[PDB]
Write a protein that binds this ligand. Structure first.
Ligand SMILES: [Cl-]
Ligand SMILES: [Cl-]
Ligand code: NA
Length: 129
């Protein structure tokens, strides 16, 4: 599923991400835009052989199991394929664990390089939330 911008904002807000660990909703929408272009089915292979999955490009080296990332952890205790669902619940719950682990949203390279320090509220402007 490819989300619209306000559709995704509303879904993330209903799943408790607005101001989760101090990150306003616009940060999450911005990250999803540049990580996956709002496409829940996005995958991308990394140099180390791990793969990023879903709307927030969660990495199989640490967070989910794809059966082909040797020596990897599965800290969200989910198959990576669950992160590609049109239901974002699994991706959101896993993201909540990532953002709480110490480094905040700096875990998302695209957020660090394209959202951090910008006017992220623009990403929810005009949305009925
Ligand atoms: Cl915001
Ligand atoms: Cl980047
Ligand atoms: Na959803």
């Amino acid at each position: 599923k490819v989300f619209g911008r306000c559709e995704l904002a509303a879904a993330m807000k209903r799943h408790g991400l607005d101001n989760y660990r101090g990150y306003s909703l616009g940060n999450w929408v911005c990250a999803a835009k540049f990580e996956s272009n709002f496409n829940t089915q996005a995958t991308n292979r990394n140099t180390d052989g791990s793969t990023d999955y879903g709307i927030l490009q969660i990495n199989s080296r640490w967070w989910c199991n794809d059966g082909r990332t040797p020596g990897s952890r599965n800290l969200c205790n989910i198959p990576c394929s669950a992160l590609l669902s049109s239901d974002i619940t699994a991706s959101v719950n896993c993201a909540k664990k990532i953002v709480s682990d110490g480094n905040g949203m700096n875990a998302w390279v695209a957020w660090r390089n394209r959202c951090k320090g910008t006017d992220v509220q623009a990403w929810i402007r005009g949305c009925r939330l």
